[PDB]
């Protein structure tokens, strides 16, 4: 004897959707910092992860980039 849900069809516990997409953008601007500033962002925020802007910000201004 358990209560059921047989009305619905409710969901798993999710992610504010999850990583489903990696086309083809070809360049070299500063993946790497770019890349791993945005894993920080993702779990505290930009204020918690603003080393993780400066640290990078330097090599997007480096290219020209509006730093």
């Excluded at 069809?9 to 500063?30: G, I, R, T, Y």
């Excluded at 779990?43 to 201004?61: D, V």
Aim: glycine share 8%.
């Amino acid at each position: 004897g358990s209560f059921t849900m047989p009305g619905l069809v409710d969901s798993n516990p999710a992610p504010p959707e999850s990583q489903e997409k990696k086309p083809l953008k070809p360049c070299c601007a500063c993946p790497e910092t770019k890349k791993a500033r945005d894993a920080c962002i993702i779990e505290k925020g930009e204020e918690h992860c603003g080393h993780l802007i400066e640290a990078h910000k330097e090599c997007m201004r480096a290219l020209g980039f509006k730093i």
